[PDB]
Amino acid sequence: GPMSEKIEGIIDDLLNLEENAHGIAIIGKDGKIITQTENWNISNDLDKLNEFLNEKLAGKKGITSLSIQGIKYMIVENTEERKIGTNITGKGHVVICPIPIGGTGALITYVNPRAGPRDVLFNVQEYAKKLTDLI
Amino acid sequence: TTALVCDNGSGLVKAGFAGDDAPRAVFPSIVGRPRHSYVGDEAQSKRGILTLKYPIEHGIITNWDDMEKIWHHTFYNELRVAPEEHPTLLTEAPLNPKANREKMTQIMFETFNVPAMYVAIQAVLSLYASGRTTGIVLDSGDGVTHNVPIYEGYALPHAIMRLDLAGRDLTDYLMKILTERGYSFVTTAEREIVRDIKEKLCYVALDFENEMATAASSSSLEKSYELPDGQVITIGNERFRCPETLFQPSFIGMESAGIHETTYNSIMKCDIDIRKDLYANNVMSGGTTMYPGIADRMQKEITALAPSTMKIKIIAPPERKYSVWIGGSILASLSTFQQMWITKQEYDEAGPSIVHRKCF
Ligand SMILES: Nc1ncnc2c1ncn2[C@@H]1O[C@H](COP(=O)(O)OP(=O)(O)OP(=O)(O)O)[C@@H](O)[C@H]1O
Ligand SMILES: C/C1=C/C(=O)O[C@@H]2C[C@@H](CC[C@H](C)/C=C\CC1)O[C@@](O)([C@@H]1CSC(=O)N1)C2
Ligand SMILES: [Mg+2]
């Protein structure tokens, strides 16, 4: 869906709530970028992000790492509510929260490497839910 | 001040005080109720007037009313505390159902009125007791065996393997194979005698077929054991055929791969970029990992499975019977953990589901 100032505001709010959210992107259900913060760019990694969000596990090993803007992340948590990636050399973390739950949109947060992604999950998950109907 | 650490297993409860090196109390996870409640050693003592049950089955709490009696006994009779005065760290199995972990949290705050609590995964705690946050644990107790690969404290997605073959099953098999030798071991009380035999005299063969040959062609492997009625028995190849079952679960008619292969399969569910750390940090945890020879056997089997140049290390700490508890003591005593506890306040606001937010 198109970007909106209603979406802008929810992101403004998240970024002030969660100090350690150092970057945001929103993927719509069609897998297109709705918006992202000016301090990063996920555009060239969207194919692999979408493959990951659409994945259906077979008990065959699925996707266990993903790269965004040259940083490779190990997937350490993978549920319908939240997926956590963490770079093995200290270059940061990502939290991907599907919108709706288990669905193909997502709120993605880049997390300060000095912080822990465990601490941001609650708010990023709530904020993914706020976006559900917007899109 | 001073947190409590309770590690609830299928066979044994380990309980104590955070910052101690060892559990204060270790006692059987049994509850007895009059024929037509008691807990632990007292329940066993009165077995002739009680019906005994295990409330935890294969690591998973299945009888909640009995499990409540276990916790009450732990706090009042074993540790001698008032639970409302101490943060309480509990433990759980890998893959414990959402509902189970909520119900634990509900009971601790509503029935025991604890001021704070936390639930940690058993293998994560064992790993941490060895001074690691990355590695693959083989955690094998009385009721369940798991393979748990862990990276920076996270149990890895879809890589945990659970096997319902552990120490109790091994005791039962040793009863059966001693019965094939000419002795008779059938009753519950006979099962306890056979558990003691297993603990004292069993071991894992480095090469099982080679060991079978040495048994059959000489008595150099035979040992003697005096029963409580005075009879002295002789045990030979049963000493190593009993724990061989971990490697060949077919011995008890299970279709599963052995613990060596389930280790490998677990590692193979993990990302390429972390497997070398798993192979290099294979920690063994739990009473069933106590058999002499087990680490060297596991080293051999994993080397046969793994890529030919892979560096492998099996770590089998001398204290691994209680490494889950010990990792919990260390963790709960840390200044930096003190913000991790679920508070009563947090519970009052969010209810039982607060556990999924906080214990992760
Ligand atoms: N030296 C030993 N050799 C072999 N087995 C042992 C030894 N010592 C203890 N065991 C076995 O370990 C088991 C108890 O281990 P532990 O306390 O780790 O299990 P638990 O936490 O009660 O069980 P689970 O982890 O399966 O829920 C018993 O089956 C016991 O016979
Ligand atoms: C010393 C001891 C060891 C143990 O591991 O105990 C636990 C708990 C115990 C409960 C029943 C037993 C009669 C009571 C006390 C024995 C506890 O069951 C076990 O012995 C069971 C039965 S045989 C076996 O290998 N595991 C394991
Ligand atoms: Mg255990």
* DSSP bridge pairs for A106: A27, A98
Cβ(B132)–Cβ(B281) under 8 Å? yes
- Per DSSP bridges, beta strands B12-17 and B4-8 are antiparallel
* Residues B305 and B337 both lie in one domain: no
Nearest alpha-carbon partner for A64 in A78, A46, A82? A78
- Per DSSP bridges, beta strands A105-111 and A21-27 are antiparallel
Cβ(B22)–Cβ(B326) under 8 Å? yes
Cβ(B324)–Cβ(B10) under 8 Å? no
* Residues B155 and B72 both lie in one domain: no
Helix (H, G, I), strand (E, B), or coil: what is residue A99? strand
**Among all ligands shown, which has an atom nearest to the Cα of B319?**
1
**Residue of A61, A64, A118 with shortest CB distance to B360:** A118
Is B336 in CB contact (< 8 Å) with chain A?
Answer: no
Structural method? X-ray
* DSSP bridge pairs for B233: B225
Q: Which residues contact B206 (CB under 8 A, 6 or more apart)?
A: B293, B296, B297, B300
Count of Cβ atoms closer than 10 Å to residue B360 Cβ:
16
Whether the CB of B10 sits within 6 Å of ligand 1: yes
Q: What is the CATH number of the domain that holds B337?
A: 3.30.420.40
Find the length of chain A. 135
Count of Cβ atoms closer than 10 Å to residue B182 Cβ:
8
Q: In this structure, what DSSP letter does residue B206 have?
A: S
User: A64–B154: do the CB atoms touch at under 8 Å?
Assistant: no
Structure tokens at B9: 């297993």
Interface test with B, best of A56, A57, A66, A76 (most B CBs within 10 A): A76
Is A26 in CB contact (< 8 Å) with chain B?
Answer: no
Helix (H, G, I), strand (E, B), or coil: what is residue B8? strand
From B234, B259, B284, the end of a domain falls on B259
Count of Cβ atoms closer than 10 Å to residue B219 Cβ:
9
Spell B146-155 as b/e; 16+ CB within 10 A means b.
Answer: bbbbbbebbb
Angle at A110 between CA A108 and CA A111, to 5 degrees: 130
Cβ(B149)–Cβ(B269) under 8 Å? yes
At A33, which helix (H) or strand (E)?
Answer: strand A33-36
Q: What is the CATH number of the domain that holds B200?
A: 3.90.640.10
**Residue of B152, B157, B357 with shortest CB distance to A75:** B157
- Note the helical H segments in A1-120: 5-17, 46-53
Alpha carbon B180 to chain centroid distance? 29
* DSSP bridge pairs for B310: none
Q: Note the maximum CA span of chain B.
A: 70
- Note the helical H segments in A3-133: 5-17, 46-53, 121-131
Whether the CB of B30 sits within 6 Å of ligand 2: yes
* Residues B4 and B106 both lie in one domain: yes
Count of Cβ atoms closer than 10 Å to residue B45 Cβ:
12
* Residues B184 and B104 both lie in one domain: no
**Rounded CA separation B259/B249 (Å):** 9
Conformation bin of residue A92: beta by default, left when phi > 0, alpha when psi is -120 to 50: left
* DSSP bridge pairs for B232: B226
Burial of A8 by CB count in 10 Å (0-12 exposed, 13-18 middle, 19+ buried)?
A: exposed
Spell B340-355 as b/e; 16+ CB within 10 A means b.
Answer: bbbbbebbeeeebebb
**Rounded CA separation B71/B113 (Å):** 12
* Residues B143 and B285 both lie in one domain: yes
Is A77 in CB contact (< 8 Å) with chain B?
Answer: yes
At A73, which helix (H) or strand (E)?
Answer: strand A71-78
**Rounded CA separation B283/B129 (Å):** 10
Chain A residues with CB under 8 Å of B152 CB are: 76, 86
Burial of B253 by CB count in 10 Å (0-12 exposed, 13-18 middle, 19+ buried)?
A: exposed
Instruction: Find, in chain B, the residue whose alpha carbon is nearest to that of A79.
Output: B157
* Residues B299 and B198 both lie in one domain: no
Whether the CB of B191 sits within 6 Å of ligand 2: yes
**Rounded CA separation A84/B153 (Å):** 13
- Per DSSP bridges, beta strands B116-121 and B135-140 are unpaired
* Residues B206 and B290 both lie in one domain: no
**Rounded CA separation B130/B295 (Å):** 15
Count of Cβ atoms closer than 10 Å to residue A15 Cβ:
16
**Rounded CA separation B282/B46 (Å):** 41
**Rounded CA separation B128/B125 (Å):** 5
Would you list the DSSP string of A46-64?
A: HHHHHHHHT----------
* Cα torsion A92, A98, A99, A105: sign: positive
* Residues B265 and B312 both lie in one domain: yes
**Residue of A86, A121, A122 with shortest CB distance to B152:** A86
**Residue of B274, B357, B360 with shortest CB distance to A74:** B274
Q: How far is B63 from chain A (nearest CA, A)?
A: 28
Structure tokens at B34: 């009059």
Cβ(B67)–Cβ(B98) under 8 Å? no
* Residues B165 and B132 both lie in one domain: yes
Q: What is the CATH number of the domain that holds B42?
A: 2.30.36.70
Cβ(B4)–Cβ(B15) under 8 Å? yes
**Rounded CA separation B192/B52 (Å):** 14
* Residues B40 and B76 both lie in one domain: no
Burial of B229 by CB count in 10 Å (0-12 exposed, 13-18 middle, 19+ buried)?
A: exposed
Helix (H, G, I), strand (E, B), or coil: what is residue A95? strand
Q: How far is the CA of B143 from the centre of ligand 1 (A)?
A: 8
Q: Which residues contact B339 (CB under 8 A, 6 or more apart)?
A: none
Give me the residue label for tokens 């030919």: B308
Nearest alpha-carbon partner for B289 in B324, B254, B255? B324
User: B154–A77: do the CB atoms touch at under 8 Å?
Assistant: yes
**Rounded CA separation B158/B94 (Å):** 11
Instruction: Tally the domains of chain B.
Output: 4
Q: What is the CA radius of gyration of chain B?
A: 21
* Residues B40 and B148 both lie in one domain: no
> Measuring CA to CA, how many Å separate A130 from each of B94, B98, B354?
32, 24, 20
**Among all ligands shown, which has an atom nearest to the Cα of B43?**
2
Range of B219's domain?
171-259
Count of Cβ atoms closer than 10 Å to residue B248 Cβ:
15
Q: Which residues contact B119 (CB under 8 A, 6 or more apart)?
A: B89, B90, B91, B92, B101, B104, B105, B355, B359
Atom of ligand 2 nearest to the CA of B52: 11
Q: How far is the CA of A67 from the centre of ligand 1 (A)?
A: 43
Helix (H, G, I), strand (E, B), or coil: what is residue B53? strand
* Residues B151 and B265 both lie in one domain: yes
Q: Which residues contact B89 (CB under 8 A, 6 or more apart)?
A: B3, B4, B5, B6, B18, B117, B118, B119, B120, B328, B331, B332
Whether the CB of B115 sits within 6 Å of ligand 2: no
Structure tokens at B283: 């920690």
Give me the residue spans of the domains in chain A: 1-135
Q: Note the maximum CA span of chain A.
A: 43
Chain A residues with CB under 8 Å of B156 CB are: 64, 76
Alpha carbon B157 to chain centroid distance? 21
